């Protein structure tokens, strides 16, 4: 059962206001025919326009919420809303566009999906709360057939052009007019009581209902993200590499080792409380410190309450030494902390919009992360950039310009002139640091942290 069988039953109750008289007994096979499409017994990679919840979760990067509202149905204008915030008005003759015929609306749909999805996914998944008009509008901008490849590259085709009779992926679709072989899922098939707004609002206060199709589209996608990544979590599902995932993860390991090592050298904490991932490894294996681990999986809904992590009776004394929260998101960090906290507001191809201000960070696995909150860091300060090294000054083995920097904490800088090895290492470390920060990570530290305390570790 890899794909959704076309013979699966589709519940039609949510469609009967736009389509009165619709049969209660309905399959996807009959629904697709009703929508004006013909599948023609084709075993050519596209068995169904609709997909399972499991297939949708694997393709979360392709999710585009889509709603269609009657402005006044072949005789009336339709308002097409997308989770990108775009509203297009199509005439049968929060960005709002005036009424235009389908032949020009379809060109805009292809451009919008292509610009949104080219760096995210090889397809589009329209996330619906299906009431009828959205399904009956698909024939005006969607074409289906066998799975195809792009005319300018090896990627699967996502667009079709009636002008040249050619197919293209999202990267080569300029001037194309039809969406080709899209996928879709109706959230209303999962079992819900009441309307979209009532189900959405139970879990989210960030998306309002300004009474336009894009608002419904955003709410629909947000509800689907809630059901698949907030209430239900799956860290076994792997997502493909689309950007700087590897460099970011390597940079995070590099920065964690640097900051913790320097905090231990500078303040000589006798104990470190490492709170978070139950599979964590000591990030500074050679440190003298008593290293104590506390297990907590990533919180996907609300940030952990510090009172629940630390209290209810273990070292017990979390006030002794220092606490390390490396992506362990809590409501309020204690004053004696070293923290790495993901900023959900960051714009990136890895960070997708999420539920209630949270974001869906997709890097190898999907992590719904609670909304960034500046008040979590009230007992701490921002950690400044610095590079520390006690490794010997020796090159071994890329042309040079001498490094001058007050934040290169090395024996050679203490001595007055940074060596080639430490200049190369400082520049590689600065690039890794900038990669981590630009990915959305934020670093915070106990207020007494002072890099001036590292200079005397060179005796
Ligand atoms: C946890 C967590 N909190 O915010 C984000 C973002 C993550 C996930 C990320 C750090 C990651 O790649 N992990 C754990 C393997
Ligand atoms: Zn292409
Ligand atoms: Zn929402
Ligand atoms: Zn040196």
Please state the three-class secondary structure of 37-106 as a single string: CCCCCCCCCCCCCECCHHHHHHCHHHEEEEEEEECCCCCCCEEEEECCCEEEEEECCCEECCCEEHHHHH
The token duo for 276 is: 């978070």
**CA of 70 relative to ligand 1 center, distance in Å:** 42
Specify the DSSP class assigned to residue 171: T
Nearest to 51 by CA among 88, 15, 8: 8
Sign, CA dihedral 411-417-418-419, equals negative
- Let me know: does 369 contact 362? Beta carbons within 8 Å: no
* Residue 445 exposure: Cα atoms within 13 Å on the Cβ side: 17
Nearest to 445 by CA among 324, 332, 276, 273: 324
| Angular region, 136: left φ>0, alpha ψ -120 to 50, beta rest | alpha
Closest protein CA for atom 12 of ligand 1? 363
Residue 146 Cα distances to 7, 44, 257, angstroms:
19, 5, 51
Q: After which residues is the chain broken (C to N over 2.5 A)?
A: 72, 93, 313, 397
Does residue 211 have a known ligand-binding role? yes
Closest protein CA for atom 2 of ligand 1? 327
Spell out the residues 6+ positions from residue 438 whose beta carbon is closer than 8 angstroms to its own. Answer: none
Q: Is the CB of 441 under 6 A from ligand 1?
A: no
The token duo for 207 is: 């998306």
The token duo for 148 is: 């195809």
Buried b vs exposed e over 338-356: b needs ≥16 C-beta within 10 Å? bbbbbbbebebebbbbbbb
The token duo for 176 is: 């194309």
Bridge partners (DSSP) of residue 231 are: none
- Let me know: does 291 contact 274? Beta carbons within 8 Å: yes
- Let me know: does 335 contact 447? Beta carbons within 8 Å: yes
Q: How far is CA 137 from the centre of its chain?
A: 29
The token duo for 88 is: 């297009």
To test the ligand 1 pocket, which listed residue (245, 248, 281, 342) has its Cβ within 8 A of the most ligand atoms?
342
Nearest to 88 by CA among 68, 118, 103, 73: 68
Q: Is the CB of 300 under 6 A from ligand 1?
A: no
The token duo for 194 is: 């009441």
Q: Is the CB of 161 under 6 A from ligand 1?
A: no
Look up 421 and say whether it is catalytic. Answer: no
Q: How far apart are CA 276 and CA 266, in angstroms?
A: 24
Buried b vs exposed e over 100-139: b needs ≥16 C-beta within 10 Å? bebeebbbbbbbbbbebbbebbbbbbbbbbbbbbbbbbbe
Look up 226 and say whether it is catalytic. Answer: no
Q: How far is CA 451 from the centre of its chain?
A: 34
Does residue 419 have a known ligand-binding role? yes
The token duo for 52 is: 């399972």
Does residue 216 have a known ligand-binding role? yes
Q: How far apart are CA 189 and CA 134, in angstroms?
A: 15
Q: How far apart are CA 84 and CA 403, in angstroms?
A: 45
- Let me know: does 337 contact 322? Beta carbons within 8 Å: yes
Q: Please, what is the angle between helix 245-267 and helix 420-438, to 10°?
A: 110
Q: Is the CB of 367 under 6 A from ligand 1?
A: yes
Q: How far apart are CA 432 and CA 454, in angstroms?
A: 21
Residue 139 Cα distances to 103, 134, 162, angstroms:
12, 10, 14
Spell out the residues 6+ positions from residue 101 whose beta carbon is closer than 8 angstroms to its own. Answer: 90, 91, 92, 93
Residue 151 — φ and ψ, nearest 5°? Answer: -80, -20
Chain position carrying tokens 């920065």: 255
Does residue 151 have a known ligand-binding role? no
Helix (H) or strand (E) holding 255: helix 245-267
Chain position carrying tokens 């390597």: 250
**CA of 77 relative to ligand 1 center, distance in Å:** 45
Q: Is the CB of 304 under 6 A from ligand 1?
A: no
- Let me know: does 140 contact 27? Beta carbons within 8 Å: no
Buried b vs exposed e over 246-260: b needs ≥16 C-beta within 10 Å? eebeebbebbbebbb
Residue 408 — φ and ψ, nearest 5°? Answer: -95, 95
Exp. method:
X-ray
Residue 114 — φ and ψ, nearest 5°? Answer: -60, -45
Using DSSP, state whether 252 is helix, strand or coil.
helix
Sign, CA dihedral 65-66-67-71, equals positive
Among 134, 177, 186, 425, the one annotated catalytic: 134
Nearest to 120 by CA among 330, 362, 338: 362
Give the ligand 1 atom nearest the CA of 249.
Answer: 12
Closest protein CA for atom 1 of ligand 1? 298
**CA of 417 relative to ligand 4 center, distance in Å:** 8
Using DSSP, state whether 143 is helix, strand or coil.
strand
Q: How far apart are CA 293 and CA 296, in angstroms?
A: 10
The token duo for 400 is: 């040079």
Does residue 222 have a known ligand-binding role? yes
- Let me know: does 415 contact 458? Beta carbons within 8 Å: no
- Let me know: does 82 contact 217? Beta carbons within 8 Å: yes
Q: How far apart are CA 173 and CA 164, in angstroms?
A: 12
Bridge partners (DSSP) of residue 446 are: 380
- As a dihedral over the C-alpha atoms of residue 355, residue 358, residue 362, residue 367, rounded to 10 degrees, the angle is -90
Cα Rg, the chain, nearest whole Å: 27
- Let me know: does 283 contact 257? Beta carbons within 8 Å: yes
Q: Is the CB of 358 under 6 A from ligand 1?
A: no
- Let me know: does 179 contact 141? Beta carbons within 8 Å: yes
* Residue 264 exposure: Cα atoms within 13 Å on the Cβ side: 22
Residue 230 Cα distances to 191, 203, 222, 302, 428, angstroms:
17, 10, 10, 9, 37
- Let me know: does 144 contact 202? Beta carbons within 8 Å: no
Resolution limit, Å: 1.6
Residue 229 Cα distances to 70, 110, 260, 317, 443, angstroms:
32, 28, 31, 34, 25
Q: How many helices (H) and strands (E) does the chain have?
A: 10, 22
Q: Is the CB of 276 under 6 A from ligand 1?
A: no
Residue 48 — φ and ψ, nearest 5°? Answer: -160, 145
- Let me know: does 123 contact 59? Beta carbons within 8 Å: yes
Q: How far apart are CA 7 and CA 402, in angstroms?
A: 70
Q: How far apart are CA 217 and CA 120, in angstroms?
A: 19
Residue 379 Cα distances to 23, 276, 327, 346, 447, angstroms:
61, 19, 17, 23, 8
**CA of 270 relative to ligand 4 center, distance in Å:** 29
- Let me know: does 64 contact 118? Beta carbons within 8 Å: no
Sign, CA dihedral 11-233-118-151, equals negative
Q: How far apart are CA 399 and CA 382, in angstroms?
A: 34
Among 211, 314, 316, 396, the one annotated catalytic: 211
The token duo for 287 is: 């440190």
Coarse DSSP helix, strand, coil percentages of the chain, rounded to the nearest 5 percent:
30, 20, 50
Burial class (CB in 10 A: 0-12, 13-18, 19+), 53: middle
């Amino acid at each position: 059962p890899t794909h959704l069988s076309v013979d699966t039953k589709f519940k039609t109750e949510g469609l009967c206001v736009d389509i009165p008289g619709i049969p209660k007994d309905m399959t996807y096979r009959r629904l697709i025919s009703m929508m004006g499409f013909k599948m023609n017994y084709q075993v050519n990679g596209y068995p169904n326009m609709f997909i399972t919840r499991e297939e949708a979760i694997r393709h979360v990067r392709a999710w585009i919420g889509f709603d269609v509202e009657g402005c006044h149905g072949t005789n009336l204008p339709l308002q097409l809303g997308f989770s990108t915030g775009v509203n297009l008005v199509a005439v049968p003759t929060p960005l709002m566009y005036k009424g235009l015929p389908w032949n020009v609306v379809r060109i805009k749909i292809v451009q919008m999906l292509s610009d949104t999805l080219k760096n995210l996914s090889d397809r589009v998944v329209f996330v619906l709360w299906a009431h009828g008009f959205e399904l009956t509008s698909m024939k005006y901008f969607v074409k289906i057939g066998p799975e195809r490849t792009c005319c300018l590259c090896d990627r699967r085709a996502t667009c079709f052009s009636t002008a040249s009779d050619t197919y293209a992926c999202w990267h080569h679709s300029i001037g194309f007019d039809y969406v080709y072989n899209p996928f879709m899922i109706d959230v209303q098939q999962w079992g819900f009581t009441g309307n979209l707004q009532s189900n959405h609002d139970l879990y989210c206060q960030v998306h309002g209902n300004a009474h336009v199709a894009s608002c419904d589209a955003i709410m629909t996608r947000c509800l689907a993200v809630h059901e698949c990544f907030v209430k239900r979590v799956d860290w076994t599902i792997e997502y493909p590499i689309i950007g700087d995932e590897l460099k970011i993860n390597a940079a995070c390991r590099k920065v964690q080792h640097m900051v913790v090592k320097a905090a231990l050298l500078a303040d000589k904490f006798p104990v470190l409380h490492d709170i978070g991932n139950p599979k964590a490894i000591k990030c500074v294996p050679q440190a003298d410190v008593e290293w104590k681990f506390y297990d907590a999986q990533p919180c996907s809904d609300k940030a952990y309450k510090i009172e629940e992590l630390f209290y209810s009776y273990h070292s017990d004394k979390f006030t002794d030494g220092v606490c390390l929260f490396w992506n362990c998101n809590v409501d309020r960090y204690p004053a004696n902390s070293i923290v790495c906290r993901f900023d959900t507001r960051v714009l990136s191809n890895l960070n997708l919009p999420g539920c209630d201000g949270g974001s869906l960070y997709v890097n190898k696995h999907a992590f719904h992360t609670p909304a960034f909150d500046k008040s979590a860091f009230v007992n701490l300060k921002q950690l400044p950039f610095f590079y520390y090294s006690d490794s010997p000054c020796e090159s071994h083995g890329i042309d040079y310009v001498p490094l001058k920097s007050a934040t290169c904490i090395t024996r050679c800088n203490l001595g007055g002139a940074v060596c080639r090895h430490h200049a190369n290492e400082y520049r590689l470390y600065l690039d890794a640091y900038n990669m981590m920060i630009s990915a959305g990570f934020s670093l915070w530290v106990y207020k007494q942290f002072d890099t001036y305390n590292l200079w005397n570790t060179f005796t």
